[PDB]
Amino acid sequence: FDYKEQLPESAYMHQLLGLNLLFLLSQNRVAEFHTELERLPAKDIQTNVYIKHPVSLEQYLMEGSYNKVFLAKGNIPAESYTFFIDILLDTIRDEIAGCIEKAYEKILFTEATRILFFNTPKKMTDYAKKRGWVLGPNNYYSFASQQQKPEDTTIPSTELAKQVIEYARQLEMIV
Amino acid sequence: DLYSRYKKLQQELEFLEVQEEYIKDEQKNLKK
């Protein structure tokens, strides 16, 4: 970007920039990802494939299209994009299950096979014991964990008293 | 004369602080 006035447009520049963006996605440094993306012209963001792929992957990751995130491996712009993809994928699974615990109250054992994108049924068992998922006799994983509600059972009387005391201060301490 | 001016300014600042403290105290008692 700096000496680009005298330097010619490198053929591999866009590919390597997309590689950097995909790496930033792999390390969950999305705030840096957008700042570095803004450095590119607004045209090649929607036009150049090497830039189009990582930004689309970011959109899919943010909106929750995890199936498209997994499919992004097949249509990578270049072979060099492969490695970072795996780095992202390990997150996606652990993210997907994070949804499953809070969204699905109970899911079948094989039903998650496409959801968790697991090839071997054996690969479910180790990931489940890592996740500590209580398998049910009917091949159903019971995710009963919403009982840990925001805990409205308790009144935050200390915080409320502090706020009211601050009101009293702002009404009296002014003088 | 630079040092004399600087020291006089320092004394003036400290005197102004004293005056403001006294004024606040006098307001506090003048309300009573």
Binding site: T158, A161, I165, E166, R169, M173 | -
Partner: protein
Amino acid sequence: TRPANHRQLTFEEIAKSAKITVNEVELLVMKALSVGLVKGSIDEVDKRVHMTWVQPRVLDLQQIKGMKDRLEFWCTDVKSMEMLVEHQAHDILT
């Protein structure tokens, strides 16, 4: 015996403890409610008795020690909240 959070006695519990039939349990509570031994209400739909007050009884020394420990916790809470109010409203406190 039950703590104040768990003073909802099922009809089965009273029937088993008092060696009486379930259908008589309500009547028993009536007497205890009429004399003044206990205070509360009866939810016959759920077959439960919500007891809220007991006739105070003679306590052992160990029970008095436990009561004093409860007072210790209560005093700790009162002191903590008093210090909190004093600290937060120090400027406006007279």
